[PDB]
Design a protein around this ligand. Sequence first.
Ligand SMILES: *[C@@H]1O[C@H](CO[C@@H]2O[C@@H](C)[C@@H](O)[C@@H](O)[C@@H]2O)[C@@H](O[C@@H]2O[C@H](CO)[C@@H](O[C@@H]3O[C@H](CO[C@H]4O[C@H](CO)[C@@H](O)[C@H](O)[C@@H]4O[C@@H]4O[C@H](CO)[C@@H](O)[C@H](O)[C@H]4NC(C)=O)[C@@H](O)[C@H](O[C@H]4O[C@H](CO)[C@@H](O)[C@H](O)[C@@H]4O[C@@H]4O[C@H](CO)[C@@H](O)[C@H](O)[C@H]4NC(C)=O)[C@@H]3O)[C@H](O)[C@H]2NC(C)=O)[C@H](O)[C@H]1NC(C)=O
Ligand SMILES: *[C@@H]1O[C@H](CO[C@@H]2O[C@@H](C)[C@@H](O)[C@@H](O)[C@@H]2O)[C@@H](O[C@@H]2O[C@H](CO)[C@@H](O[C@@H]3O[C@H](CO[C@H]4O[C@H](CO)[C@@H](O)[C@H](O)[C@@H]4O[C@@H]4O[C@H](CO)[C@@H](O)[C@H](O)[C@H]4NC(C)=O)[C@@H](O)[C@H](O[C@H]4O[C@H](CO)[C@@H](O)[C@H](O)[C@@H]4O[C@@H]4O[C@H](CO)[C@@H](O)[C@H](O)[C@H]4NC(C)=O)[C@@H]3O)[C@H](O)[C@H]2NC(C)=O)[C@H](O)[C@H]1NC(C)=O
Ligand SMILES: [Cl-]
Lengths: 210, 208
Amino acid sequence: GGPSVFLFPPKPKDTLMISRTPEVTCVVVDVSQEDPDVKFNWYVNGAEVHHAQTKPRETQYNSTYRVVSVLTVTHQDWLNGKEYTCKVSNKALPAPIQKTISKDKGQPREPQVYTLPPSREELTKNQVSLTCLVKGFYPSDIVVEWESSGQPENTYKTTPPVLDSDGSYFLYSKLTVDKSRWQQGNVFSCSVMHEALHNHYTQKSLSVSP
Amino acid sequence: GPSVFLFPPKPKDTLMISRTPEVTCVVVDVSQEDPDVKFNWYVNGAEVHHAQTKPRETQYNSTYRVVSVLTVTHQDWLNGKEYTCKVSNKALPAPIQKTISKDKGQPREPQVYTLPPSREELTKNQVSLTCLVKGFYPSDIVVEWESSGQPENTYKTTPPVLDSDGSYFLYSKLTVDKSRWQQGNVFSCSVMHEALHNHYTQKSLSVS
Ligand SMILES: *[C@@H]1O[C@H](CO[C@@H]2O[C@@H](C)[C@@H](O)[C@@H](O)[C@@H]2O)[C@@H](O[C@@H]2O[C@H](CO)[C@@H](O[C@@H]3O[C@H](CO[C@H]4O[C@H](CO)[C@@H](O)[C@H](O)[C@@H]4O[C@@H]4O[C@H](CO)[C@@H](O)[C@H](O)[C@H]4NC(C)=O)[C@@H](O)[C@H](O[C@H]4O[C@H](CO)[C@@H](O)[C@H](O)[C@@H]4O[C@@H]4O[C@H](CO)[C@@H](O)[C@H](O)[C@H]4NC(C)=O)[C@@H]3O)[C@H](O)[C@H]2NC(C)=O)[C@H](O)[C@H]1NC(C)=O
Ligand SMILES: *[C@@H]1O[C@H](CO[C@@H]2O[C@@H](C)[C@@H](O)[C@@H](O)[C@@H]2O)[C@@H](O[C@@H]2O[C@H](CO)[C@@H](O[C@@H]3O[C@H](CO[C@H]4O[C@H](CO)[C@@H](O)[C@H](O)[C@@H]4O[C@@H]4O[C@H](CO)[C@@H](O)[C@H](O)[C@H]4NC(C)=O)[C@@H](O)[C@H](O[C@H]4O[C@H](CO)[C@@H](O)[C@H](O)[C@@H]4O[C@@H]4O[C@H](CO)[C@@H](O)[C@H](O)[C@H]4NC(C)=O)[C@@H]3O)[C@H](O)[C@H]2NC(C)=O)[C@H](O)[C@H]1NC(C)=O
Ligand SMILES: [Cl-]
């Protein structure tokens, strides 16, 4: 065989909100038991050591080890565009293998969010769909949630971001509720966090017309 | 050695009545000498006939890329027949076979609604017009926009995402100029899907 390494960025939910600790993950996989166990190096624009913790080794049937090193990262540093490199070296490989990842390049444009009610043609069913259009943002990392009154809602789906003709991204969020629940004036809320929003968060809400 | 990928027809090929749908068995990583790959095609365990080889195009990395193609009938593929391409080669210790079909499951007919621009989108120079196509299965769908008579150009469609009830849905976004939309012009969202009456529906939208 021949081990291979994958670098994984943090988590948009974990880099945008004030509750999660973001991190970069160097996954060395297909490590054979002959000449096992690896050494990482970790560079930040060509930098250094530090807070680089390697998580517990985990065995796979595949007659092999999978081992993961994790570099915790500040929110500011990741959103600035600092480039993180993990270089893996192992006696089972001819030369060390290096991987570098960063935030997606490009000027951040901000999302415009529009709440679309249900269609008058679909208002004849028992469950109807509230649409939230989130368009014109860059990069594609965003997070979208529905909330009514105060409770987060529970039966909604969000599309992947698809590259608009402009170079910005858009997506849709659909929340299906009961027509009775909609029509009673219940106020639902599409709420988004993204890099280019003021406070990294906006919320726009939608209720039935008069 | 070489490795196989079976490929289904295009939804557009198998729906629109204007194309000819095929199943594509592409053999990758076939070597220099000891090339020549044998195909065997089976339809629910059948064989022979209409299995046409496409011309050997030499890929760079010291490799040939071989491709066999089997023409299928729309009815046959949409009824859920199982096509299987098997490939024999001297480099292989035992032939490799892959089988592909249409996605299993009871076809569900797509609901399609057209959503007009949000009222705070009525300042922006370009407004967006939404088409929500929900409650269909399988995902194999085709969505186009047209206007006046001929089709429209500035629109983008989302991928089909699995819903909570086992169906699929998608969105299409057409970008029009506010003046074109407010002056009463009419746009149309046209869907092709196997569970529609006549494989086709079109719902139109205008500034009412
Ligand atoms: C031995 O067995 C093990 C385990 O067995 C099996 O594991 C899985 C896959 C299931 O099938 C199980 O049933 C089964 O037990 C094998 O382990 C796997 O090894 C492959 C080797 O390639 C890895 O594939 C890569 O996966 C990444 C994405 O991986 C994410 O998603 C996976 C789900 O599919 C998930 O399993 C991963 O853990 C990982 O999940 C992320 O994890 C991080 C941190 O843990 C977490 O923070 C994230 O939230 C989480 N995210 C998600 C979405 O889950 C995939 O991207 C890779 O694609 C590369 O390779 C393809 C071939 O080129 C190509 O199509 C891709 O574009 C990409 O290619 C590279 O791409 C970039 C540029 O885009 C660049 O770096 C490179 O230049 C380019 N080319 C190359 C050559 O690198 C790839 O598919 C599996 O992740 C891994 N699964 C594990 C460990 O669980 C092991 O390989 C087996 N070995 C043998 C010999 O059989
Ligand atoms: C020599 O070079 C050529 C090409 O050169 C290079 O190609 C790419 C990678 C770029 O870097 C170029 O810049 C560069 O020039 C190499 O050719 C490629 O070789 C790989 C070998 O694995 C093949 O990978 C597979 O790709 C398919 C998807 O392929 C479609 O899309 C490609 C674009 O990305 C396109 O190039 C293909 O032609 C093909 O396009 C389709 O073609 C059909 C018919 O021709 C057509 O009708 C369609 O319209 C068209 N569609 C589109 C969108 O264009 C991918 O699906 C494969 O994934 C399998 O394997 C992965 C690893 O496990 C896994 O993630 C997937 O899930 C899937 O795995 C299988 O999945 C199912 C279960 O889900 C199951 O059947 C299997 O159990 C499971 N596992 C396996 C092992 O099958 C796969 O990644 C490329 O297609 C191929 N491209 C060619 C030939 O054009 C060549 O390999 C080089 N030689 C080397 C490296 O030695
Ligand atoms: Cl239904």
